[PDB]
Amino acid sequence: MFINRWLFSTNHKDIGTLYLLFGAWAGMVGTALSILIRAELGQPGALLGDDQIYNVIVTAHAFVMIFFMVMPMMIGGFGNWLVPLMIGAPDMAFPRMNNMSFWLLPPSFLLLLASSMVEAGAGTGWTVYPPLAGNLAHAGASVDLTIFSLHLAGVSSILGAINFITTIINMKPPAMTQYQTPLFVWSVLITAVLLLLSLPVLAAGITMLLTDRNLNTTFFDPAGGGDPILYQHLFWFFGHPEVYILILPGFGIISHVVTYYSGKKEPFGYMGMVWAMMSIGFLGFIVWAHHMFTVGLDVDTRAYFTSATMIIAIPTGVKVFSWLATLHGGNIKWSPAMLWALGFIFLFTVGGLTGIVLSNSSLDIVLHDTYYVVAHFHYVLSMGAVFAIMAGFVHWFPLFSGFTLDDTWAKAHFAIMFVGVNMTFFPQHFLGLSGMPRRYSDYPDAYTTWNTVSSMGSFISLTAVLIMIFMIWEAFASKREVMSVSYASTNLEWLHGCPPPYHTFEEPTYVKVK
Amino acid sequence: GSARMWKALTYFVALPGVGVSMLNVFLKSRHEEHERPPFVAYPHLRIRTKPFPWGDGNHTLFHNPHVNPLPTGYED
Amino acid sequence: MAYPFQLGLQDATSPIMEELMNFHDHTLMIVFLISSLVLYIISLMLTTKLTHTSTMDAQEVETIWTILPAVILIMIALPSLRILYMMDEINNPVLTVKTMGHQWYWSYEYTDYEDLCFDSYMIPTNDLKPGELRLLEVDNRVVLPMELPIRMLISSEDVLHSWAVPSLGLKTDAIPGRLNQATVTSNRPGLFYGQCSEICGSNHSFMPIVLEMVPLKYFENWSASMI
Amino acid sequence: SHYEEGPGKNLPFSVENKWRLLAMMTVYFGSGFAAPFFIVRHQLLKK
Amino acid sequence: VHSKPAREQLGVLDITIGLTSCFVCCLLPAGWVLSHLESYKKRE
Amino acid sequence: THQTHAYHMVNPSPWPLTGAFSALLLTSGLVMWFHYNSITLLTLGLLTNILTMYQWWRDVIREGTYQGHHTPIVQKGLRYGMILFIVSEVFFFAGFFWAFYHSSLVPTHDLGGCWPPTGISPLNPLEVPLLNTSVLLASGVSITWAHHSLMEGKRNHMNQALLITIMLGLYFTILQASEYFETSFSISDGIYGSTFFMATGFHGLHVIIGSTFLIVCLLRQLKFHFTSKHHFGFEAAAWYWHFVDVVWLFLYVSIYWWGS
Amino acid sequence: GGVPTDEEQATGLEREIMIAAQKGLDPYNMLPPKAASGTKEDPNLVPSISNKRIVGCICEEDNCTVIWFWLHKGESQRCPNCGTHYKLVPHQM
Amino acid sequence: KIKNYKTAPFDSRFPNQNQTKNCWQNYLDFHRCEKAMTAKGGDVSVCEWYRRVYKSLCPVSWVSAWDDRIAEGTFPGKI
Amino acid sequence: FENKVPEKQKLFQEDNGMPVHLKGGASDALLYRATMALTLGGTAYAIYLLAMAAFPK
Numbered sequence A: 001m002f003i004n005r006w007l008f009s010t011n012h013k014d015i016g017t018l019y020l021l022f023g024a025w026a027g028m029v030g031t032a033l034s035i036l037i038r039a040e041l042g043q044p045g046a047l048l049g050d051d052q053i054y055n056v057i058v059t060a061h062a063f064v065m066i067f068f069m070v071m072p073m074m075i076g077g078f079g080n081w082l083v084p085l086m087i088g089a090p091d092m093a094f095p096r097m098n099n100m101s102f103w104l105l106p107p108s109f110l111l112l113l114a115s116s117m118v119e120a121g122a123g124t125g126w127t128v129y130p131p132l133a134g135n136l137a138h139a140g141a142s143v144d145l146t147i148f149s150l151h152l153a154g155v156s157s158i159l160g161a162i163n164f165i166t167t168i169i170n171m172k173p174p175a176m177t178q179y180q181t182p183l184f185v186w187s188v189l190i191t192a193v194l195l196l197l198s199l200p201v202l203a204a205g206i207t208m209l210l211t212d213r214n215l216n217t218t219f220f221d222p223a224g225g226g227d228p229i230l231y232q233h234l235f236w237f238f239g240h241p242e243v244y245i246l247i248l249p250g251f252g253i254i255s256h257v258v259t260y261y262s263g264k265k266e267p268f269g270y271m272g273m274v275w276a277m278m279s280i281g282f283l284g285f286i287v288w289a290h291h292m293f294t295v296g297l298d299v300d301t302r303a304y305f306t307s308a309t310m311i312i313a314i315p316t317g318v319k320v321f322s323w324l325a326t327l328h329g330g331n332i333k334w335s336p337a338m339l340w341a342l343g344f345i346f347l348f349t350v351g352g353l354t355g356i357v358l359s360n361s362s363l364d365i366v367l368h369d370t371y372y373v374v375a376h377f378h379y380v381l382s383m384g385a386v387f388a389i390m391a392g393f394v395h396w397f398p399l400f401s402g403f404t405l406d407d408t409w410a411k412a413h414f415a416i417m418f419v420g421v422n423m424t425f426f427p428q429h430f431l432g433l434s435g436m437p438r439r440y441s442d443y444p445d446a447y448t449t450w451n452t453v454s455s456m457g458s459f460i461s462l463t464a465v466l467i468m469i470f471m472i473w474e475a476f477a478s479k480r481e482v483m484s485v486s487y488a489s490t491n492l493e494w495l496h497g498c499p500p501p502y503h504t505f506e507e508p509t510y511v512k513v514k
Numbered sequence B: 001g002s003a004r005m006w007k008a009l010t011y012f013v014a015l016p017g018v019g020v021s022m023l024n025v026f027l028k029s030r031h032e033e034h035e036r037p038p039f040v041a042y043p044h045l046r047i048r049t050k051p052f053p054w055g056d057g058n059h060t061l062f063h064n065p066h067v068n069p070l071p072t073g074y075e076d
Numbered sequence C: 001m002a003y004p005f006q007l008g009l010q011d012a013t014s015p016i017m018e019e020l021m022n023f024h025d026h027t028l029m030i031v032f033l034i035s036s037l038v039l040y041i042i043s044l045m046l047t048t049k050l051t052h053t054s055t056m057d058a059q060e061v062e063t064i065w066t067i068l069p070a071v072i073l074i075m076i077a078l079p080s081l082r083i084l085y086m087m088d089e090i091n092n093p094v095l096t097v098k099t100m101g102h103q104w105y106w107s108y109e110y111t112d113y114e115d116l117c118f119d120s121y122m123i124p125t126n127d128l129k130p131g132e133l134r135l136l137e138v139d140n141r142v143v144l145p146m147e148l149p150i151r152m153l154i155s156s157e158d159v160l161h162s163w164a165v166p167s168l169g170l171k172t173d174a175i176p177g178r179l180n181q182a183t184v185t186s187n188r189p190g191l192f193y194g195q196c197s198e199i200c201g202s203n204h205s206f207m208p209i210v211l212e213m214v215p216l217k218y219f220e221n222w223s224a225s226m227i
Numbered sequence D: 001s002h003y004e005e006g007p008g009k010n011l012p013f014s015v016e017n018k019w020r021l022l023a024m025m026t027v028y029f030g031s032g033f034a035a036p037f038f039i040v041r042h043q044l045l046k047k
Numbered sequence E: 001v002h003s004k005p006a007r008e009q010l011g012v013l014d015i016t017i018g019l020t021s022c023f024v025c026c027l028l029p030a031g032w033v034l035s036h037l038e039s040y041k042k043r044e
Numbered sequence F: 001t002h003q004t005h006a007y008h009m010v011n012p013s014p015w016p017l018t019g020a021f022s023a024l025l026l027t028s029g030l031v032m033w034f035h036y037n038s039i040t041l042l043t044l045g046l047l048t049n050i051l052t053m054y055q056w057w058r059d060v061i062r063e064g065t066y067q068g069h070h071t072p073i074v075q076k077g078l079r080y081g082m083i084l085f086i087v088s089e090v091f092f093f094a095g096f097f098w099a100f101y102h103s104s105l106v107p108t109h110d111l112g113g114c115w116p117p118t119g120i121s122p123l124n125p126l127e128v129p130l131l132n133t134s135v136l137l138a139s140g141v142s143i144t145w146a147h148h149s150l151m152e153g154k155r156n157h158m159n160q161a162l163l164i165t166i167m168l169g170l171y172f173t174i175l176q177a178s179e180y181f182e183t184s185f186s187i188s189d190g191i192y193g194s195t196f197f198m199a200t201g202f203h204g205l206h207v208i209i210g211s212t213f214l215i216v217c218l219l220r221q222l223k224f225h226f227t228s229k230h231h232f233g234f235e236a237a238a239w240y241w242h243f244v245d246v247v248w249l250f251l252y253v254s255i256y257w258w259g260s
Numbered sequence G: 001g002g003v004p005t006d007e008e009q010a011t012g013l014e015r016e017i018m019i020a021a022q023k024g025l026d027p028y029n030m031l032p033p034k035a036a037s038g039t040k041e042d043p044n045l046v047p048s049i050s051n052k053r054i055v056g057c058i059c060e061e062d063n064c065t066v067i068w069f070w071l072h073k074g075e076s077q078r079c080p081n082c083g084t085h086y087k088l089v090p091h092q093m
Numbered sequence H: 001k002i003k004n005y006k007t008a009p010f011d012s013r014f015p016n017q018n019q020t021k022n023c024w025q026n027y028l029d030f031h032r033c034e035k036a037m038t039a040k041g042g043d044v045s046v047c048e049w050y051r052r053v054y055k056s057l058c059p060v061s062w063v064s065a066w067d068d069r070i071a072e073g074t075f076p077g078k079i
Numbered sequence I: 001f002e003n004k005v006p007e008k009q010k011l012f013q014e015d016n017g018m019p020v021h022l023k024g025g026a027s028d029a030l031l032y033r034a035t036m037a038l039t040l041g042g043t044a045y046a047i048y049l050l051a052m053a054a055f056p057k
Ligand code: HEA
Pocket: A126, A127, A243, A244, A246, A247, A290, A291, A293, A309, A312, A313, A316, A317, A318, A320, A348, A349, A350, A351, A352, A353, A355, A356, A358, A359, A360, A364, A367, A368, A369, A370, A373, A376, A377, A380, A381, A384, A385, C034, C068, C069, C070, C072, C073
């Protein structure tokens, strides 16, 4: 029964369950890696010795937190729970490759663990920039294990994207216009499309690098007419679409929780919402070289890339103003999901504006790969996507398990993690403007004070992680049920029981003729 | 009518076209007896940074001793 | 040289840094404008009490909500292109200095006449002579003249590096087989400190940049005194 | 019907014993938080 | 979202055990490794 | 009768699990083959992967033609997903062409500043690649004749078209291997040899995959699985082969003519 | 002769809906329904195999948000924010 | 000419930051200079400017490696 | 070759309780035990080789 239901799962509810479990485990691993990094960066000196092992720690932090936590949490997990219940589908379109992609993920995590085991280590970062990852600087197998973990995660993401696109544009009720679905479906649709168009790009790049090492070829070897700049181009043509992957279901989740707990029967400017989503999806592929302003590109190319980066800045601002407009006029129920959404709005605003300050090109000629960039993507990702994950997590938990959350303790978690991430991530503005680069295991005397403040705030965030896992235990132990759910008339997922049964939508929805 | 037309194109255009291209290559392969180029140890050719995971690590998967010299020379 | 409790940039020495910091506080007053605006809007709807859950009119405010941030972004972007044109200006190369990032150190080459190449290593904490700065000092400094636009041809030997002096205002990636050109100018003599900014092995944190710029006469006095 | 449904019955782990649930969550999240620390100690022993 | 009463309400002691229980085994591993890093460091 | 919606409810299956772990075996065995010279893990991974794929598509066929679970909207989902798969390797090979174009349009000083790099004579593109692209075009016109012979609905031309396509694809693979054996440079021979051999090898592997599609569709037609309107196996084989044909046309034009 | 025709080849759910397509009545909800008239005497007829079925009123033209609610067997219930009538009928299949 | 200068000028043909191609062009046209004037009997010391400009533009390791390529017959360029 | 589809169309619509991946007969059950016995045995052999790479002599 156990091996029939869970190891051989063919229903999206339990598939999202196992997504949530794997995402929680990866969040634990990434939290431990971040705490170890801050243990380096809370007191000057070689607490571990060499910084190669520290680079292994930061590489594992980046890989585990991006590919194994955020995407399996909200893209796989929340999508797999929600979008059949959102569009009235009985199941996903191809649940068998959905299960394949899920069970593809723990081999990727295991290959990354084996990479950490190998004595060479993955001392490269999220960027796997050759010739650092070549046979001379890394004479080992660890970077090959990382590349194969990227292969596993990439083919899982491709399969999930195909399944999500097929489910979205196929098995909505036939009288429904495509411009009538809830916005999380649109967000995960644009997410899956960009996954589909950007994951073969990583496949090409990492096969290029794997062939460069193991098969004596010269794709990025300067001694054979190759160039690492090609890998940088391919990897960032991956990279900025991938960070928009990591932010788009955040847009959907925050829009849904705002329009739920704000009392509005509809979000403000649905057409503007969908237009902004497709606009940042379209422009996410032609701005990939804003990470390339110091490499040595042509200057008119740099001017075009920063101008197009402003063009990607504008419709995100349209999205933010539509969120403020749909917040306007509604009575605010003080559930913790609104607290997460408001934290997302403000912290994502300041993170995106920090991204604009980076996006000015000469400001990257002064400010590339410092801790200013660290502050930017930890504002917009490490608590943008994280706060969106938290909002969806504390919102749909009565739908996921049947047990509610107690508002006082849940808000206590929110307040402590908000304070912890702010204290962690606000000093790196001064750290980057004062001018220390990334991937350092020890820092100078000017940066000592803000590094210590950031590490202390990171320990506050760790205490928040403890209170979260205690809260999951407390919900699962107290087992208080759901008496009723409001706004189920507008939100289709909440009306089929908390939790919904194994076989949902066995009778299709009667969609209006108009 | 479509299926007939495609059958006619396959038999009267595609098959004669493949016959002419095969005859072209077959006649060329009988007249051409290529003068193996002299070995020059160009530093950008025959690069070996790591041995291959097969054989002696120095022969390519589709090695041909007559046309593919090693980093040291031809094998003969 | 960065001082403790620093919130802005290391102060300008180059005119390009002067326009960078002017544009920088332009961007800071812009971001503070937007941040204060969104704070007051958020505080407005969290402090309100009235309700409106009727049909909200959508096609009235997106026009201004599209056009006026477009003005804000274009007035942000115009000085960026201006400074890019300042780096696109022609050069007066009194000297050509080439940096070659080697595995965990640097090598600097002055080759215009009487080719000399020296090695910028890392000084250890226990071997620091009294009074210096930790994690920054180099036994062999990089000597430049002041007030002169000098070419900086930047490459690396076996692994990627990133030559980055934030005080003077230069940061370019040292790439094997691709040397970038950076225009180094200043207005003052003395020591200037920077770092390597790209991951490059087991001593990535241990590659600093020290540049001492003094009057031309002392520069050729140094160059003659070594050889 | 074919699979048992209800609040807490759609999880792969048992929920009824809260102390057993506490033990399994403790060992699960402890392994999750302890994996990178055993990585760093294993590499310190190896180096 | 209204919630039904807890089927297995936790007592003051239960909450105490729960909070500490994990904190204990969710930081114990961390403490062990960090506290002895210097020993571990010994190639011995 | 328990479902009213016309969609498909898959019974629990072990091959997601075993295919994912066989991919784990494949990648791990690649690591052991490159670094620890043990081929056995790679062979076991290949065997498990091919056998898992065999039984997976076996079960897909069994729920397709022996049970009739591919409703019109279900095969609409199938053709949407196949289109998404096609554009997935469109962007995959587009990234490969990006690598080739960044190598060729701006040659570095290590190649002599000219394309192709000096030292090795490039292969003649006028005879054997022209025979290859004629083979691909003949196979494509045979596929579209076969699908029109499905529309007309008659087995003798259907079978003749499928056998001549499989013979053309096998001939193209043999000629590809022959020109690998009959070339003056290796994959370890410069950037141009590296990108040319890697791109052509990926395309040839895709040709082998498409040949497996055409073989299994032929054995499915000989066993009367296909019908007059529900022939999505041959539709998917047709789309994959047309993708293969257009990719070979792009590779032919770009590599064999642009700077040769 | 030639290839088999799916009319006498394919069996199962595909054959059942193929017969449904030839006879012109769709009981398995592959097509949008009809009779968009929801008065008191003429409610919208919703066919269900059970006692209860999810309906969605698109009760305004080009409305981006659908209104989701259940019907139970019995009297014709109205859409909560517009007020058009729906009556649920047993399919008996 | 036999002019006396300080450093290499700003070549307007090559206005970007990449000067690997600049020293590449300098090395190639220095060598075509040397072969052209030793072929037609001109003054071989008229592009000492070209020798000093490639010496200024590209590193000593590259220069010595390329001179070894000349000394063996291994140079990939069109010389 | 003969049209054996309708006779194989009777051996799979039997509501005998076996899932779709096992209705064909004893060959399919043998093959499914075979793909269990080498995937799980391969995975256990894979993690041993990774551990042997992790820990030198
Ligand atoms: C969540 C993931 C995420 C998101 C959304 C973004 C969004 C953006 N990112 Fe970033 N980025 C990363 C993740 C992300 N990024 C990561 C992970 C890296 C580093 C990776 C590595 O180095 O390894 C990175 C790096 C990175 C750099 C590299 C700097 C360097 O190294 O030199 C730059 C610079 O251009 C940049 C820019 C931007 C911009 C301009 C946006 C914009 O999309 C933000 C837009 C959001 C806004 C909120 C706009 C502001 C609009 C308003 C406030 C409305 C009101 C406005 C007016 C009235 C005018 N990002």
